[PDB]
Amino acid sequence: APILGYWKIRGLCDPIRLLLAHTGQEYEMKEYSIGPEPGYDISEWLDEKFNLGLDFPNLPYYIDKDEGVKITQTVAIIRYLARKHGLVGESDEETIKIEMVEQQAIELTLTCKRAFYSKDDDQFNQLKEEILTSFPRKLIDLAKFLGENQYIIGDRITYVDFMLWSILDYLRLFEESLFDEASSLKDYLTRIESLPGIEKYRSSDDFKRLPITAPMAKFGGSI
Amino acid sequence: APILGYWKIRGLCDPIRLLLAHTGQEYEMKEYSIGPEPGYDISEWLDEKFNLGLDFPNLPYYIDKDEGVKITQTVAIIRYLARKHGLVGESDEETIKIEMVEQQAIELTLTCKRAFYSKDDDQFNQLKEEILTSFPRKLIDLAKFLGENQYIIGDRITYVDFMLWSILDYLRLFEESLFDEASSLKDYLTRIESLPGIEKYRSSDDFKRLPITAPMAKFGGSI
Numbered sequence A, B: 001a002p003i004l005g006y007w008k009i010r011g012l013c014d015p016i017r018l019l020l021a022h023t024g025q026e027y028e029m030k031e032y033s034i035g036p037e038p039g040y041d042i043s044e045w046l047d048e049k050f051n052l053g054l055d056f057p058n059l060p061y062y063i064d065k066d067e068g069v070k071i072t073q074t075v076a077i078i079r080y081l082a083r084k085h086g087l088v089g090e091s092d093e094e095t096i097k098i099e100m101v102e103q104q105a106i107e108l109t110l111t112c113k114r115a116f117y118s119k120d121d122d123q124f125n126q127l128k129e130e131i132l133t134s135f136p137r138k139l140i141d142l143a144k145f146l147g148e149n150q151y152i153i154g155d156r157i158t159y160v161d162f163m164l165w166s167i168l169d170y171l172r173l174f175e176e177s178l179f180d181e182a183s184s185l186k187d188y189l190t191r192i193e194s195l196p197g198i199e200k201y202r203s204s205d206d207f208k209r210l211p212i213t214a215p216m217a218k219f220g221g222s223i
């Protein structure tokens, strides 16, 4: 059985788990606990970190002995899984669209990552301002690109829908007014959540006990 | 002829231009000037920005009427060009390696972007400290991954070599001592610089007049 390793948070790994939930692929979830403040012990991870034969030892990792793969870096993992499960473009035209949206999703995600784990309120309010200021335009551009489509490239769901859904879900939880009346993207969120594999995952206890972030975060550190 | 549009800086578009220089592809370079301090007018860009039919209007863009493509997002552009010019993985094994390194290059790039365009000396010296503390390890990990190889997947160069070269070149110019744990990465820089198409591009006056960053930057704003 393949193994996915990560913290006990939604975090970076969320789009991967949604992809795996949608496809129904069996895998073992290996979870690493973070101890309480102020020491935030991560000893479980450090005990395996160097012992797993990883090139770039980090979480998440994806290992599948049978297929002979060992992968770190969320986007490399999710693209690997997309190719395996047929959740990629079936023409260059689709691939271009997927990859443009993919970079937009990554930018949103990495800006939020920096905001959520800000050191002091100073740093946090600075990035919050950036988010509230720049993101509305980016969500409008995404809505305009999605149009009347069900998913990014149209009728068929692809891996980027999971990346986009994840970061929009985080933003909705961070500041609802970014999307409260943002109608098309709300329908998009609803549509992807209603897919049976994702619905089953989101209604499971394992998901409901996951905070968005690790406990030291300024946002999302608890359920 | 395809068109590549960008500011008059190396910036995010450097790896694309290197890839195009290696492959010899003919293209028109459309450049947008930045007005002087303190307003940094970008009116040249705004005059075309909405008129180009781009989904996510931004710089860089790549347009090729004949092929019917219109692309923004640096990484989507470079992957498009990689597939066209055969600079991608030939197996899932190679692609996994390429994509792990790709994400590393992007992380380095986006961290440098935030440092280089810091608001004040305070913010700049804070982010400089983070780079001088975290980056040596990241360069060691990259060196270890490259091993005795010529390029990331071995004897054949691929698109990510251009992405990695570009960000290592910026780092070398930002803080040379960073490459004290990697003689191997300096060899990698030299090796790619020595390819005929790259040598021709880097010795051209068009490249020599390009600063790394736009003029408002704390680092790399002049030639």
Ligand SMILES: N[C@@H](CCC(=O)N[C@@H](CS)C(=O)NCC(=O)O)C(=O)O
Pocket: A007, A009, A010, A011, A012, A034, A040, A042, A109, A110, A112, A113, A116, A117, A212, A213, A214
């Ligand atoms: N939650 C963030 C990033 C998740 C993540 O992996 N963050 C790191 C901290 S920057 C973490 O969980 N660290 C756990 C630890 O090492 O204690 C996101 O959704 O982008």
Ligand SMILES: N[C@@H](CCC(=O)N[C@@H](CS)C(=O)NCC(=O)O)C(=O)O
Pocket: B007, B009, B010, B011, B012, B034, B040, B042, B109, B110, B112, B113, B116, B117, B170, B212, B213, B214, B216
């Ligand atoms: N060179 C930077 C990014 C280059 C870039 O495109 N920067 C922006 C500013 S954040 C720019 O040139 N825009 C022109 C402007 O400020 O109007 C990097 O290392 O990635």
